[PDB]
Amino acid sequence: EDLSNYIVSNIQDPLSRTKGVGDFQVFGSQYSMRIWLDPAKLNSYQLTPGDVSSAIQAQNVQISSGQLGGLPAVKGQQLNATIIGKTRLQTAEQFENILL
Amino acid sequence: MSKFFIDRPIFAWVIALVIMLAGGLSILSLPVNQYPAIAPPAIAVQVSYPGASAETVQDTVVQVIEQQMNGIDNLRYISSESNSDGSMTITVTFEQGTDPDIAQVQVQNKLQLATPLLPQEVQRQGIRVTKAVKNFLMVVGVVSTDGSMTKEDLSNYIVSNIQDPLSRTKGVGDFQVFGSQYSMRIWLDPAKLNSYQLTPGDVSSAIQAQNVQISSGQLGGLPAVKGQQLNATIIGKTRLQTAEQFENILLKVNPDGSQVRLKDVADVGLGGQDYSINAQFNGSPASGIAIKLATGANALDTAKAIRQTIANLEPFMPQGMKVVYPYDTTPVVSASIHEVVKTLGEAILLVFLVMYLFLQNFRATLIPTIAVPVVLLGTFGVLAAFGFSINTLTMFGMVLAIGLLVDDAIVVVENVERVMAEEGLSPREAARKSMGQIQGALVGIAMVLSAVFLPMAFFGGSTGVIYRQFSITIVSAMALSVIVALILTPALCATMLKPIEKGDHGEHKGGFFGWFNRMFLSTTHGYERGVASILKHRAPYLLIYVVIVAGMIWMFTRIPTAFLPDEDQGVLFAQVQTPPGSSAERTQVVVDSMREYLLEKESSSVSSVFTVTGFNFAGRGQSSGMAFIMLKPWEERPGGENSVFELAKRAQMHFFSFKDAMVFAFAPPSVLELGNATGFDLFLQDQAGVGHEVLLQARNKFLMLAAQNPALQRVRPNGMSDEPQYKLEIDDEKASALGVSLADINSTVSIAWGSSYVNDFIDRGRVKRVYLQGRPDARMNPDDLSKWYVRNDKGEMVPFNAFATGKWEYGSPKLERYNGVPAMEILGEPAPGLSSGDAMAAVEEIVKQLPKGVGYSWTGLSYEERLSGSQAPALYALSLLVVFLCLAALYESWSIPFSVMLVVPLGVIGALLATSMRGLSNDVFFQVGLLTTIGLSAKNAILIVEFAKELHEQGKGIVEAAIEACRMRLRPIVMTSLAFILGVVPLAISTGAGSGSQHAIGTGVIGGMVTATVLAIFWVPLFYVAVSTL
Amino acid sequence: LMLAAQNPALQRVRPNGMSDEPQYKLEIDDEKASALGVSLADINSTVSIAWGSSYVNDFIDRGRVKRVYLQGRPDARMNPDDLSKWYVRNDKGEMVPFNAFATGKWEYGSPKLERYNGVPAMEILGEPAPGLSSGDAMAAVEEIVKQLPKGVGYSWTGLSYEERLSGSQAPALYALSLLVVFLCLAALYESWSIPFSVML
Amino acid sequence: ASAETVQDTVVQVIEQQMNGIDNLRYISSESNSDGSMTITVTFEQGTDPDIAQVQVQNKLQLATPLLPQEVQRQGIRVTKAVKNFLMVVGVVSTDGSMTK
Amino acid sequence: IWMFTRIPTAFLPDEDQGVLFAQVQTPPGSSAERTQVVVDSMREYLLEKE
Amino acid sequence: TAKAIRQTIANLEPFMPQGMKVVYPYDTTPVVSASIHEVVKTLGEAILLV
Ligand SMILES: CCCCCCCCCCCCO[C@@H]1O[C@H](CO)[C@@H](O[C@H]2O[C@H](CO)[C@@H](O)[C@H](O)[C@H]2O)[C@H](O)[C@H]1O
């Protein structure tokens, strides 16, 4: 799995843009965030996979926030900066600490 | 073949007649424009993700499209930018000769494959794929005089009023308007909202549900039971036409039995989609169109068209609506093809004179006057055949080409009459005779010249594109003149020239001519004597040849390596960048001042200023603005002071003060497509998916090591640097505690702060957008963040003060990728005197001291340089090897060929000297003119070595055959060099439109001619005799 | 067509896209709607899939994917008054008629609206009367085109655009061809005499 | 949609992009009350129909975003217009076993 | 130069191609059952008479 | 195209984690080299035998 992930994330796209290659098939995958539900728990807290999903869909989001120097601005304004709202997660810890 | 046509003048005429008609017809159809497609074809994919951040676009949009950007034909490299406003741009670069049409389609199709994979807000936005090449014909300005209308008001005007009529006039290609049409914009008041306990999100769904053109059925639709007799149809609902209607949508109905409406929440009015870039033409706001020449069209006719068209519209246009034409290319294009028909006509003029001078007959005067236009017309036909265009490079190609055109006429006419003079043969027999002498050498020289030019056409890249233009055009002329000078001129001589009695040299002619013939008669003898003594004392001279050779290799190592020339296109750039943060007011005033300084101190040279904010050549955003300084016509500002290059000087002086922003002034590249000419560029990139701030380290170690380097100077980074960013941090816990859902908290911080593309309304017929967003005064400061309330678990409105907590972190306002990986572009020039090859050599050393995990790759003219550069030696050796072989046959020796090739240097130094004496450089115009000169120089030598060996064959001595040849050849070579230097002088001293390139050629031409004429005549015989012996 | 039916040169003079057709309406105020509890999510997407139809789902049929469609009964869907028969649910439970919750008027639309080169226009065909020819025909039209309002222009298309082409080439044609025969005869027989005599 | 609201929300806007295509001879659009639209672009008597298609496409990739949210869903068809029918292959019921 | 100017200009010769087209354009809004009647009388006049 | 892919991967090799090496499991091109080079060889043989 380790190797497969290199290939795809690193040498795949360069290869796929190399002159002459018209198609390619990788024997493996690149990584992904894996969420392994367990009904032996879902059950307890009386929860469904559907309830999960919808959470991930709302807690692992890259959101269009805005900026303080908002354009069109107000006369005199002299402070412009991008405000960055919720930005999606990288690590499992971040994925482990989402509230259902 | 010539002895054949000499007896068939009518046939000979008919061939000249056809080559004429073809050419004549072809010059019609033939397209007209300033440059070929010299730039690597590129396609741009662009969207804006309203309210998004540079990361919320490279990570949700760019990276995606990229991962689907493979399996496209002829892909060279691919580069993207994702910046602080919603905007994104990915540019896919293709190899030269790639049909933009299929490139586009291929690239846009892969775009489709990744569309559904994209954020629905972007998806809904609409992604544009465009040919991303800056061949802008003209640039129409449309301004508001009385400041009544804004950019937004105006761009809507040109979209519904002058976009259709523009697109429908001949030769109009890809235009792009500055700004969008209209869109219903609404601005929510948080205070006023909280009141009626309504959330932004509500307003959205409110308008989504109350503005629809619902599917309508049919009254009598099939199937239908008998009796059916009305199959008419019904029209469903309708969309909101006015902003008034957008104020009547019920948001809430109170227990009081009252009606709450949008008015009671926000202001509703027409506006623009994106407010990110502001354009002012002399203080007052404006927009306009950047027009491109339709593929195949005539840049002249089409400029007139897109001028009368937005002139049949000026009456109807509102008050204050004045149309300007800031940038326009047809002036120069028109000029540099007036200054061709001119120098052509005067060429044949000068020939008629210099012809008359040395000769007598007004008749001999007629030959070259027919045989030259005939070759010009036809030469165009060949261009059609090859699908070339009448353009700036293609026409200069013909300028350089008359040197050769004029020769083949007078070389042939002079020689018939020399034979007539010294043998008293008739027109025919003397035609028949000389054509026997020269014929073969003509075929011979046509091939030698071919090897001299053609190679350059096999160059890759954009340099190869411009070379190929000269090559193909000046080889077509050459070859075509050789055929005309084989089947047309000889007959013309045979037919039109009058006879002359043996031994007659016009010495007793009396009058001025008598003086002249006598004088020249003496001078030739002088020449013979010179040569005669040079052959009687070889060694010393041979030595002095080595010397002048040495000096040629010296001059090359002491001459500017610059790319193509620098002209004075009536434009000057001013790139403004106020410090991080900043605002669309600050920057907008830094540039607002630049207009004054120019229009109050340089009003002697500056016509008008077109200024822009929120947009650079190095970044988008508020901390960046620009000024396109437009200069008065060429005449109305003469003198070196009123030159772009002098204007730029003062500008940067005055602009050097400003300790707020950072203004820079400079002139566009010679050719207006990413022209760093002599200036490298590069992408640092992290192959090993290392940190982004690790990249920053890598970049900063680079620059702070390029300074510690001798070889490079002015190593800047392209693209803006990190700014302070205000990071929100909503508390997933406290939020649910109060009872507020994350869905509502985000969706609310969205529509409030970043825009929201909501619904489609239709007005004036066309569908336009509808943008929901918070009040300006409601989103200017961190505290304003609190003014926004979300509805709780139920009933109560909760303020951001509750869960929202701010922080000031750093980030990049413009993220860059190159070949799928994140990168940072850096520019630079080589130190004074050093070459780009030296620069690159050094850079490739200060890249090994980079953070393991970071790599690089050349991208611009650099990528090209390194390619075309590798083939240079190959091509030279090939033209060398082929030229020899051709001479080898022309003479039937492996030796005497060298007696013609050693002539090359003679004419070179003259060009070099003149070029440095004039303080110019290795312009492509010089580089090419340098071949066009060792062309004639060669032709001159081959004919005199030709005649030389003919005599040695009739059984004369080498030394005698040499001097006898020289004597025979002197007259002709004097009349061409005289005819030619004079023909080119005007260019060498031209002033005004495009003069700058006309200088690049003439300067070195005269230098090359003068030095090669004088020197060839003495050293060629030296060479011939020398080798014949050894 | 007035003059076209009268003029003795042309026949079968058709149009394309006849006059204007009768249409209806469905004016509906969001007032009475939200009165008895009916938002614009039901009454909106309920009129559509009843009077016209509605592509809903796919379904396999002997191995070939096809479509399931939702139309109202042909009985109640074929006439103006058959509007009221349709009821929409309440935000509370009860049902709501189209009576005091929707009105229907009566207008005139237009079956097809035609454009040529960024401009509103209308195609009109026609054959030439027996004996006469396409040209003779295009001649007549060319005149009964002036009897039109100063602003209603015209232009040929298709098979007539094609005829205008070959007509406007013949001159150049014959010319260049004469020109060639002259030159070739000239070159061939080293003469200006016999070419020039051949031409005559 | 009405034949009038169609020619004004779809037709009118794609022509403004069909304008100025290589070898364009003329354009004839058609707006119906079926909601159906169909603009026809005729090229000159010797141009390559593929690039002609490829070109038309390339221009649409610029007008689409100005189209009703509805149309953008459907999918606009680009295809090579012919006025001819080679021949109609039909089938009849020889008994009464099958209907229209 | 006289005859030339007095002969009818045309394009291609009309030609019997064993084929004919009949377009029925029944009044606006008329029923599908109303058109089908007019189109059947076609067959009659044709299949039965000519 | 084979010469190219090796130019891409050999351009990416210095950034692979210290431990792993790119290998070439299945490759058809080597035979195309070998086969022609073999004919070239039978040329020098023919030309020499002749
Ligand atoms: C030369 C600088 C370096 C290279 C990159 C930048 C080059 C200059 C780009 C200028 C683009 C200007 O023109 C643009 O017009 C369009 C409307 O058509 C809107 O901008 C927008 O167009 C459409 C909406 O129509 C959006 O979907 C798109 O995402 C957005 O880019 C703005 O009005 C304006 O941004």
Ligand SMILES: CCCCCCCCCCCCO[C@@H]1O[C@H](CO)[C@@H](O[C@H]2O[C@H](CO)[C@@H](O)[C@H](O)[C@H]2O)[C@H](O)[C@H]1O
């Ligand atoms: C009367 C005139 C008679 C002759 C008329 C025709 C002259 C033709 C001259 C040669 C034209 C060569 O055309 C030119 O070849 C070079 C290769 O050599 C191509 O360029 C390609 O090959 C070179 C050499 O391997 C590479 O370094 C380069 O990266 C690559 O893109 C150009 O893209 C092509 O346009």
Ligand SMILES: CCCCCCCCCCCCO[C@@H]1O[C@H](CO)[C@@H](O[C@H]2O[C@H](CO)[C@@H](O)[C@H](O)[C@H]2O)[C@H](O)[C@H]1O
């Ligand atoms: C009128 C029709 C004439 C048809 C024949 C025309 C011949 C014209 C002159 C020679 C053209 C040579 O075309 C040229 O060949 C050289 C050598 O292969 C290529 O160059 C490449 O190979 C050579 C040999 O390995 C290398 O030393 C060189 O570094 C490399 O770049 C050039 O990039 C290409 O442009």
